[PDB]
Amino acid sequence: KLANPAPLGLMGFGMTTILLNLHNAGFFALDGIILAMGIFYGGIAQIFAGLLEYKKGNTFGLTAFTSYGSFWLTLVAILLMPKMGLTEAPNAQFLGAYLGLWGVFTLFMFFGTLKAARALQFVFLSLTVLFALLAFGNIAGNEAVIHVAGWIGLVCGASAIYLAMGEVLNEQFGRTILPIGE
């Protein structure tokens, strides 16, 4: 059988999500830490994980990991293209619409997890909320909502890491080490 690529994808998503949202929560400025993780781990590694779902027959995983890997690359390009003299910093309402579209994608995909493990359902539920809060905060110009999105993002990202490690450990031992609501 082929390896399970989902833990790779979940880890890249989860760790990067936590780091971005430590900034959104207001602990840190928008550091190169986030941008670096967005490029290689949330971005490129997650895209690998999505592509690896193809031969596994997993349409959901292919769609999800490759899309959110692409999300991270788009976010980093949005943030860095002004540093390169290519564009201006984005209009925050337009950024909100973009985050909103990612939220709508996530909401539909959430309904797709309802016949899957509860842990995965929670990843997509909290991710839907995260995008919705980030979309609102940017469209309304409400920094308090962004701060709260940040905290939600910490839980979202942590839950993805939990799921990833539950999948690795449960496979390694051939039993439920970490329950993921299978």
Ligand X SMILES: CCCCCCC/C=C\CCCCCC(=O)OC[C@@H](O)CO
Ligand Y SMILES: CCCCCCCCCCCCCCCC(=O)O
Q: Does 105 bind ligand X (CB under 6 A)?
A: no
**Contact letters for ligand Y, residues 114-143 (x by CB under 6 A):** ----xx--x-----x--xx--xx--xx---
**Residue 165: closest CA among 35, 38, 54, 15:** 15
Could you tell me the smallest distance in angstroms from the CB atom of residue 39 to ligand X?
Answer: 5
> Residues 54 to 113: which contact ligand Y by CB under 6 A?
100, 103-104, 107
**Residue 102: closest CA among 133, 71, 125:** 71
Tell me how many residues contact a copy of itself (CB under 8 A): 89
> Residues 75 to 94: which contact a copy of itself by CB under 8 A?
75, 77-78, 80-91, 93-94
Torsion of Cα atoms, 151 then 161 then 51 then 80, to 10°:
40
The two three-digit tokens of residue 94, written as one number: 């337009």
Q: Does 109 bind ligand X (CB under 6 A)?
A: no
Could you tell me the smallest distance in angstroms from the CB atom of residue 56 to ligand X?
Answer: 22
Q: Alpha-carbon distance 155 to 148, whole Å?
A: 11
